Curated annotation (Swiss-Prot), chain B:
Modified-residue entries (N6-acetyllysine), positions: 190, 252, 260, 342, 349, 384
Gene Ontology terms, MF aspect: ATP binding; ATP hydrolysis activity; ATP-dependent protein folding chaperone; protein kinase binding; RNA binding; tumor necrosis factor receptor binding; unfolded protein binding
UniProt-recorded name of the protein: Heat shock protein 75 kDa, mitochondrial
Function: Chaperone that expresses an ATPase activity. Involved in maintaining mitochondrial function and polarization, downstream of PINK1 and mitochondrial complex I. Is a negative regulator of mitochondrial respiration able to modulate the balance between oxidative phosphorylation and aerobic glycolysis. The impact of TRAP1 on mitochondrial respiration is probably mediated by modulation of mitochondrial SRC and inhibition of SDHA.
Residues carrying Phosphoserine: 101, 122
Expression across tissues: Found in skeletal muscle, liver, heart, brain, kidney, pancreas, lung, placenta and bladder. Expression is highly reduced in bladder cancer and renal cell carcinoma specimens compared to healthy tissues, but it is increased in other type of tumors.
Residues found modified as Phosphothreonine: 105, 412
Residues of the full protein shown: 70 to 553 of 704
Organism the protein comes from: Homo sapiens (Human)
């Protein structure tokens, strides 16, 4: 009772016609606006990252040109009263051509475009896809942008758009070199006019940006990205704990893949995990799965620039390198513990044995 | 000190230049290829899904012309020797114009155009985003397509491309109405020229496709979508085999609930509780698999339940591998939480002993459910499932909190319990004999994850839960 209808029944007649793939751009834009990210909030994340890059770029050229570095800041003002968000940066900024192209062309990344020339600033430039800015439209009735290029005879420009097929660009002056982005919020999104809300978002995704950051005049950071160089406040921060670390491991490596990671073991038991970053932007607040589940008591921070990220940037690409990275971490963690039950008496077992149950939890598997 | 650089300094001099958004089509195709899906295998799913659409559309228009229908099938052929995987449908197929537009334009969906022109057959069309076909480029050096429209004076065409910004279209003779897609696998992807591998993929995602599917000659979709049938036209042998499929188990369900609602959104679902003692329901949309693990659509305390939940309108992520949450998955999951809680309380009300060992085998999850829940009405909801033992009824028997709210009244004011590892310690306790001869009644809990549960519940049915080993 076999049944197939697949047979070699075709014959191509008359020479082909050659064509070029094209795009339903408005539908692409809204696909990003309502079918790409899990939470609306990440739009902030995206914008911040843009700013970072803008700044990074600037200083790169500046550094490579023996010129002093102006104050390089990122500002977030929340206007509750007028229903808006604004993010502004002292970065390199756009010209009109750069406007039209980088903002108006979908999937264009003048950042990765910048990258394909450089390798220091290559390690901190964050964007790669060319779709992130459009996250604004998740929450925006309308987007207002003013920008001006660091380069000499630059005019200011007003690039604005409603989020649908057409953007428009007028010449605007009185724009500070860099870029300001005013977002006028949708009704169901006025919650981002809240300083407290925006604060929580930034603390969530961009708590560790390489440039000073001022929400409504208050500075944010001053929390150093320790996993790349008082593990105490860092443990009790990332693990969220009024507790302090029994055990600590700072683990950098570039054999296997580039990994910059720190692991804590906390002082209470659980009764009843980690967190993954890339280029100082949060990928998953609770990071699953890049740590064997018997090791769920451990937590802290794993970073790797060389993780392929999903288009959403909230996901690892389970291109199998990732849970083989998992395996690498299991290896160095084991070696960590056996070594630290030979550097002290303590040890591997009755020491922290609210966790011995995690290791024949361990050979459950 | 407060520092802000942001102030309204700008002023617009001119008048605007108008522009249209454009796109980098090649980088986009590549974004679909290397950065969208969690695993490559899903290209099969997509093809099949989009293939499915072709048939449905054809059906819809043949029926709307009063035509009889052709044989409406889906065929997959793996050729290991030429390293290709092929999918052919006998659906509507494409004209030349339809080839250029529907394959050549990114995010173009002739399927949802077809839908935005359409009632009845609208529940079935899978596609909406218009990027799915391109998933083939995850695994293809090159893609051969032949298609001929079911339109009357149709010609046949060969649309072919390597996934790099350019495709070509030729006229072709000998094309059967519908579409053949021959995928020429890449070197590290001839993995998908295996009959076993592909069979696995097909059963994983596309096991309930509403058209007969033949792989290398064999019929595949042989299992009926039981959650869309009327609850009486399914009874124990199909429920057993369906459970023993979705829950990968080799026992029987203790409990079976067939739940259908359009209160909020369309739910067509089955929930099973297994008969083994424990040592994630499956999510579908339009008969296509979304998550093996449907987390989150059920609260995590109901993770012990297995089975299937389907909904036509679950907002899908661009990947179709994830759920995009709107207001509606919160509400979906509170719908399912309460329908399940009610299920367990009333099926306790119809058979008390089977519920008794349901509690002795699964009470653990309800305890957890009560300690974790934020809203306390919810805590009380789960609390109606808790059965403890009591002093006033013989050793062994259990009782609900509500039965104790009924059995204590008049001038009695609170509920409470005593926790201890055995009954004889509970029944021989200083604290309870003190509770016994001013005697108001005291519950007995011997699974002291029960006193944690009771401490977090704190109050049930307009009353507090007070301790006796704390008076
Ligand atoms: N604030 C800004 N200042 C200067 N240039 C910017 C700014 N925001 C965006 N751009 C430019 O416009 C592009 C659009 O940004 P975006 O949509 O975020 O894509 P991307 O940052 O390049 N990569 P991704 O964010 O992952 O999609 C950037 O790549 C820059 O070239
Ligand atoms: N097997 C097929 N037979 C005929 N037409 C097809 C077939 N597959 C795709 N098409 C056409 O190509 C278009 C693009 O489909 P596709 O890129 O797979 O995404 P979509 O089906 O439109 N929606 P989605 O599944 O979410 O991506 C469809 O709308 C059809 O017009
Ligand atoms: Mg960006
Ligand atoms: Mg499709």
């Amino acid at each position: 009772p076999l049944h197939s209808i697949i047979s070699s029944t075709e014959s191509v007649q008359g020479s082909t016609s050659k064509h070029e793939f094209q795009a339903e751009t408005k539908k692409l834009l809204d696909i990003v606006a309502r079918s790409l990210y899990s939470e609306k909030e990440v739009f902030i994340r995206e914008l911040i990252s843009n700013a970072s890059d803008a700044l990074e770029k600037l200083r790169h050229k500046l550094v490579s040109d023996g010129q002093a570095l102006p104050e390089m800041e990122i500002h977030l003002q929340t206007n509750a009263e007028k229903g808006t968000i604004t993010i502004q940066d002292t970065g390199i900024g756009m010209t009109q051509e750069e406007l039209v192209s980088n903002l108006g062309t979908i999937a264009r990344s003048g950042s990765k475009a910048f990258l394909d020339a450089l390798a220091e600033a290559s390690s901190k430039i964050i964007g790669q896809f060319g779709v992130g800015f459009y996250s604004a439209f998740m929450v925006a009735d309308r987007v207002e942008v003013y920008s001006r290029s660091a380069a000499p005879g630059s005019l200011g420009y007003q690039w604005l758009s409603d989020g649908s097929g057409v953007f428009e660009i007028a010449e605007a002056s009185g724009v500070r070199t860099g870029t300001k982005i005013i977002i006028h919020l949708k009704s169901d999104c006025k919650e981002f006019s809240s300083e407290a809300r925006v604060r929580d978002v930034v603390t969530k995704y961009s708590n560790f940006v390489s440039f000073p950051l001022y929400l409504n005049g208050r500075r944010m950071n001053t929390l150093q990205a320790i996993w790349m160089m008082q593990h105490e406040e860092f443990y009790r921060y990332v693990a969220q704990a009024h507790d302090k670390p029994r055990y600590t491991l700072h683990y950098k490596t570039d054999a296997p893949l580039n990994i910059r990671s720190i692991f804590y073991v906390p002082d209470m038991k659980p009764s009843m995990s980690v967190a993954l970053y890339s280029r100082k932007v949060l990928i998953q607040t609770k990071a699953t799965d890049i740590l064997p589940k018997w090791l769920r008591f451990i937590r802290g921070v794993v970073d790797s620039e060389d993780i392929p990220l999903n288009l959403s940037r909230e996901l690892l690409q389970e291109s199998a390198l990732i849970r083989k990275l998992r395996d690498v971490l299991q290896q160095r963690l084991i070696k960590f513990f056996i070594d630290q039950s030979k550097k002290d008496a303590e040890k591997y077992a009755k020491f922290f044995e609210d966790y011995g149950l995690f290791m024949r939890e361990g050979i459950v598997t």
